[PDB]
Amino acid sequence: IETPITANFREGLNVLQYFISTHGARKGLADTALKTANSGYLTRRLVDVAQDLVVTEDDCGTHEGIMMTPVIEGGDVKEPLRDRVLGRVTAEDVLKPGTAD
Amino acid sequence: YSYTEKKRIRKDFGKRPQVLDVPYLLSIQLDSFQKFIEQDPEGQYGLEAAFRSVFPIQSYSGNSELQYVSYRLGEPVFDVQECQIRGVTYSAPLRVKLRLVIYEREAPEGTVKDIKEQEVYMGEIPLMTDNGTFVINGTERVIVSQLHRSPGVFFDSDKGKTHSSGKVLYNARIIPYRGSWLDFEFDPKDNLFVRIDRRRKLPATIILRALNYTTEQILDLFFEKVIFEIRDNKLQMELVPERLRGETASFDIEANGKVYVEKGRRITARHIRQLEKDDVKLIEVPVEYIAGKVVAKDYIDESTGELICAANMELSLDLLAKLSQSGHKRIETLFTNDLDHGPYISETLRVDPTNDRLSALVEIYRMMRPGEPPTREAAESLFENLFFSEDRYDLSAVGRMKFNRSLLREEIEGSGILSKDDIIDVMKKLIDIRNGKGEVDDIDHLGNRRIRSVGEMAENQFRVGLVRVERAVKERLSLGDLDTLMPQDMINAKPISAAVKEFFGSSQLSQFMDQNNPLSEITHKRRISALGPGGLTRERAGFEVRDVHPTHYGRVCPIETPEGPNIGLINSLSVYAQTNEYGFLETPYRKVTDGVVTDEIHYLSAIEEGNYVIAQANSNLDEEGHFVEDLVTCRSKGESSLFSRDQVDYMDVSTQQVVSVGASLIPFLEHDDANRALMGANMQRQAVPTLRADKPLVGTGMERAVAVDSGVTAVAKRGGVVQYVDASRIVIKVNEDEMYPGEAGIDIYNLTKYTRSNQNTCINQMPCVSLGEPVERGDVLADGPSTDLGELALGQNMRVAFMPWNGYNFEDSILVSERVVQEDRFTTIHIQELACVSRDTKLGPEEITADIPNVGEAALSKLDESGIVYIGAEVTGGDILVGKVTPKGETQLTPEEKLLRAIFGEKASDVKDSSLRVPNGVSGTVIDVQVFTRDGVEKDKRALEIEEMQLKQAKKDLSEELQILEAGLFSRIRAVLVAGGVEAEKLDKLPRDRWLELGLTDEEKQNQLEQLAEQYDELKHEFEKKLEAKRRKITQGDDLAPGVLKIVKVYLAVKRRIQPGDKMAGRHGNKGVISKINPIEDMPYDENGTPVDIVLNPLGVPSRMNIGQILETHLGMAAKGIGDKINAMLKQQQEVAKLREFIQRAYDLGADVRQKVDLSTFSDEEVMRLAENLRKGMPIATPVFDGAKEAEIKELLKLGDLPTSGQIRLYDGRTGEQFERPVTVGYMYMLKLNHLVDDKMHARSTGSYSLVTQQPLGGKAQFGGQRFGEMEVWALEAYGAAYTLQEMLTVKSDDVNGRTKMYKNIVDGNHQMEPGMPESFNVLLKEIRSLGINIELEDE
Amino acid sequence: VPLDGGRFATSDLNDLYRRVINRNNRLKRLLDLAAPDIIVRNEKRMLQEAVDALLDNGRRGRAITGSNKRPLKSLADMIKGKQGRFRQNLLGKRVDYSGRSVITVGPYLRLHQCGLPKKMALELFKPFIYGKLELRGLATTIKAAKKMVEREEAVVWDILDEVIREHPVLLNRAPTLHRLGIQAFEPVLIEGKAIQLHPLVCAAYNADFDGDQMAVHVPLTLEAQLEARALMMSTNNILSPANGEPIIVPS
Amino acid sequence: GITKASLATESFISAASFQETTRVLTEAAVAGKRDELRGLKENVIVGRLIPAGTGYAYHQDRMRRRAAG
Amino acid sequence: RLVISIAKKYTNRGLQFLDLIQEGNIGLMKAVDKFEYRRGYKFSTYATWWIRQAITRSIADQARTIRIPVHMIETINKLNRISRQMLQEMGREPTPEELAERMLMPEDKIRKVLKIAKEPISMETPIGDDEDSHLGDFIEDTTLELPLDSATT
DNA sequence: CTCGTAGAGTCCGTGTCA
């Protein structure tokens, strides 16, 4: 709506301004009362597919691995390297930016 | 002010003057059911309507009809109270006079016989109580009004989803009140299809063909024709000048000498204007242009007869050439402008395989019941009865009104059945909208939503019963012989009453009355549901209907609705709202005469409301309805803006009209977020009546309206003087003005004492007034449950302090000081009922004796010889209440126990114990006992004692009433006897009956003495007959269920004290659990030494934007400050002068207030009374939105001599050192909610299991365990906790052998296990093996 | 089964089986009678209908029940679907030795314990109490032990205290979104009917003290006790399983 | 997609647990398919020790005793 | 069509219309094979007779779940006629004593018949506004020996 | 290049969750 609510709760709202916020809150409540059902269904499916996975072996012994970088989404580094790599096992030796390190 | 008002006036804030006061709050229910009964001649709303609709019932062409006279309501056999006690439906018998008339065949026209039936009985109809309820089986049920879509025609859009390429496809739905539905929808290719209500898709034109319409007739009725005449040569067109509007020309359009439209340039407005003013009629046209037109009629070779062009054939050179050599001058094509006039019916005709009427009826008949051989007559009758038979298809007066309004016809009232013109017009409107010269309507507009109250639904179900019986009577009237039997054997009453009682009992919308708080009753009766028959289901809809429409303003409350899954479908009715004559929703508005804002009110519906510019209530008015601002704030079409002074047609009646009553009670609503307003309102309606209700310090003014309107208070009908008051009855001496001329006498009000409410709460009425007090008509005699001096007092107001106290109010949890329980101010009384039934087993009837095998005499001590608890004995969990034993033999005991019996000589008792002992953990006083024996069985002594008590009591009461009324009658005879010669000195010493036998001058005066004598005699004889009747009602054996010998009901009264775990709340949505009860000293206390009552966590305010509670606390602190100041001034017993001056200064407090108080009232004593009532704190009244400004609170606080900021320094009760930064303290009105810990707490070790799957039962009556759901299984798997899950899955619930192994091991002090196979899995194996699938357990 | 009140309750399969058997017997007799072709056809049609409703009612004309308009439940309905079975009754059971009640804060608790009402404690641990009562000889037999528990004498409280001393309990809140929705605590007996919960963990439970209720289970076998005490004790789960950060942070 | 992937499990009791039961049952019946349970959810269903966590060793131990002499 | 015409009478005794028509067909065939034109008897009546003789017999026997003697059914019919007449004339209802008056039976069998007529309720009947549990979810299994008693033994 | 056949896309109705 073009015109906003000029008053605040310390002062007093008026009939129509309330009406409007009433609509807002009603929609919000229904929104939650449905995000809960959808989230429940989704998580149930998820656990369904992933049920059997168990850590069975000590070490598979592969040389494979994925190159992890800091996610610099456009303007900046939204999430640094350290948090993305903390607690992961390494695939191979890392060198300083200068060889033989 | 009135005398109840003079008792205690409430200080009112609030600036605008209430023009209309709130109406009678329950009007809807009472007046609607009144309209339902309403014996009236003119067939309007009323049973009469149903009868006249169905009757007269004509024989199967036998010419022996059954005709209707009238109906009569029998008097209920059982009064209300006894009906509640005995578990019967409170109802009236209905009797109908009918006439059977039989003609002769063949007679020279003349009715051979007419015989009249002696008021045949047509069943029982439940009556509504004075408060608007129904007692159906000794429980009060309420029928909530139901909102649903009005009958009529509605045009839906269904945009977007239609193939994901736009294709905005419209559809017209015709909905009748009674009958099948019609639907017209389009298709991707713009072909118009008709479907019957919820069936397959037919080509729409078939219906028009089924209507007996010829193809050419159809296209005539729809499309605008174009004539191609032959004038001197080659097929030239007659032209409507505007017709080409927006159409590129295909040829060179010159006419009558001048080129108008250039060959190739699309016709512009300029050329059209040229032709228009030049008035060019006819144009020669190239034959190629005609190569594209369409053929309207079927032009055959009229000379020879051979057809050339067919119905709905595209025009080609060959056809026009064939016609021109054949010599046909007039060709009729259609005007198909793909922009405006689309080829919709044309395309349907092209796809249209059916041609004749007969083929259409064939398709209908074989579509509605696919597979049955179609017979011509069968199909004709099918269709005729489908849509034009009066009985099956009726729209309504309402349906017709909306229908004609949608098609804008001057006529409001139509014929019930759909005339063909109706359908044709409907499709016309559909295609018009499809072109884009029209708007689609939105179902969610309140103008399309109708409210059906009780009377209408009762009428419908009664209609259904009648149609059943009508077919029945036709069967009996046509086959069987006519003249022997009289007209009562033909009709069976069972199904009618069956249907009505079915509706009243087992329906979604007929629900238990929510009866624990007066607000609960009032709001539950004023509820609007979209559920039920003919309405929505929770799963289908759907956000459209849940959201709040701008139309709801002032008609339905936007803020009150359950937050559960059914949000939006309850939505309680607004305060001032009413129903229109047609069952719509209408609200009052004040008229505006261009300059003056008058006081005449008009009720407007939604549709009319849309038109006008209405100003809001919050507009400043000077002394004669003049607006101070030239630019005022209004809304006209659902949009608010600023409009000039000289434009507003109407104005809001009062500020409150937007909200329901429940929300209307919350103070300072203007400052609270909608969410917490919602939660506050919902919770507030669940408050439980406390022991001593007092009053809200900060109310809204509705308190008296609700209190009076609820039926729990006792209200004066004829004002007078209180002659006698006792804690059971109020006897009022009428004022001579109000005394009826013939037999006025005095008025007696019997009050109701502790009876059990639907939720097990107590409802007790206490007298308010004192001896000799004068009362006026409409005054409040006695306060009902949770009511004070006429005002609604749901809970109590206590001193709260907002501060964190050792994390004991960590979360919304609440701390409480021992002081409250010390004064016992939150103790509730609960009256529970318990039932013992003695049935007939196959081994023999059960017994009630007190002799119970192997019971200790300790528990038997409290039973009489008959085995029933003494009235007034105190019991606790486990004690035995009523002894009962059951026949049981042939035990076939195990050997070792046989050895034991031989050893000790223990004669095994052949009767098992069954006595109804007190439930675990409940302890209270048994207040009453009732015993119901079926007729025939030998009443036990105790039953006889109870009948003796009841008899003598009823006798006593009847004598009581008769004597009081007779004393009043004689007093009035004396008051008349003083006129015409005073003789009271002689009179007072001669006997009382020697006052009627005396004489006076023969006049009207002697006639009035004669009146009073005749009234004395009549009262005597009625007393005698009603007494005898009462003893017959008491004695008669009661009708019990098959198999039950007798029943014992016991009412227990438990006193529940507030304790840790209970739930308490405020009115603003703040909640909490009482976490700890502290000694008085531990509580923080102010410098003055008064300790606070509750310590509430502040961190709940800012995040949950309900700030109003803070202002409430401030204003209440100010009010109690006034209260203390006046109590202090009273304890010093200053003088009338001092109190009067101070009290006036207080009531004044600034300006802009509509209060208008003394000095008028009596000068000394009544002021002292008012001070006595106000010493507990002067009550303030802010209406919801026209409320108290901050500055006014500050000012009043200054009047109290208190810190203007509302904070005080507080000292810690534990250490004695002060708190930094003084804190807000003050009184808030808090509520005790129905969620009581003792009810919720629950545990089981071992108990009953289920029959099929040997799992433990779920529930509370039977112990019942928690449901370990799959989500918890996953939780367990997240850890490596396998053994816990294993035991939980098998030994703990489902494995019987394992569970016993576990019990034995546990008791012996060993902890091992024995997993076994879960029983449910075995069940699964057996169940699928029951199917044709072999399921085996393999092994390797 | 005969429910109290001379009326009877039956599963729908009784009606379905009865109908099928009726149609079977009627067809047998019809064959013995050599009825015309049309009648044998009609009989076989109806028998087919009955069978298919018996196996899976809902893929045809919805054979309703006696006078109740509700469609009767066929075998597949019993198996298939959430409300019916596998989902409903075989991962959604109803355990024994369980309780439920409203929660309250009670800040003074240690991180690894929880306030538990006495009366629930007796109700749950009934059999443990019996065992200890019989072991120490305070009660001659189990029946006398039961009477002694229902008298609620001081000795009963003493034995209950000793059993509760080291025995762990599981506490749960209904929407167990993540694995921390069920956690183990040591019980501490308190008066009243409210369960007392350590504040720091309420954030982990997503619980609020505004009338939210919690369920309480008792691990029975010894191995279960150890599983609870080792893996599920509150103190063992301070870091979120989702990300490594602490969950029990002050609120 | 996770639903289909779930649909393609080896054990038919797993698939029967949450999808169209009739479909999986009929498929498994015609195929004569054999479910060794091998998984977590099946082991839950039959009420034996889960092969995860504390119970992993058990099944692993059982494996040495299983399918041997 | 004759069988169909007569069948529509019996249309509310817990019997799929088609079963009714089938029983009628059996009765009609029986009549036809047994019909005697030389015995002197109206054919149509003979047919309809057998039709009813079969239809009523079938409803009496296989209608109720618990099969009940046919004379008992006739007793119920008499009771129902008498209840209807007395109720519609009196308005209120006839009490079992009044019914015992109207018929000469000793009224012990009156209430016996009333008990017998009660049909079994469907175990799945949904409980009020809580379509989550049915009736089956409540019935408890009394057969189970109590664990306490096993320990005692 | 057209006829007959092959392939791709769409629509309707049903099954499937709360």
Ligand SMILES: C[C@H](CCC(=O)NCCC[N+](C)(C)C[C@H](O)CS(=O)(=O)O)[C@H]1CC[C@H]2[C@@H]3[C@H](O)C[C@@H]4C[C@H](O)CC[C@]4(C)[C@H]3C[C@H](O)[C@]12C
């Ligand atoms: C009696 C009333 C007529 C309204 C009317 O016109 N009153 C006259 C009022 C006229 N005045 C006094 C207001 C002056 C007007 O200015 C004159 S004018 O209307 O403007 O011409 C008609 C209109 C709608 C009808 C009800 C609905 O169908 C639903 C339902 C159908 C059932 O099958 C029978 C019962 C129900 C409840 C109907 C009852 C009754 O049948 C109603 C109320």
Ligand SMILES: C[C@H](CCC(=O)NCCC[N+](C)(C)C[C@H](O)CS(=O)(=O)O)[C@H]1CC[C@H]2[C@@H]3[C@H](O)C[C@@H]4C[C@H](O)CC[C@]4(C)[C@H]3C[C@H](O)[C@]12C
């Ligand atoms: C109407 C009567 C007042 C009578 C009166 O005032 N007579 C005055 C008579 C005066 N005269 C005629 C003798 C002339 C005198 O000479 C006038 S003067 O003294 O000389 O001025 C009222 C006032 C108190 C009322 C009674 C109480 O409820 C208790 C009582 C017990 C029952 O459990 C409950 C009902 C009972 C029966 C009530 C009876 C009756 O309802 C009473 C007496």
Ligand SMILES: [Mg+2]
């Ligand atoms: Mg909560």
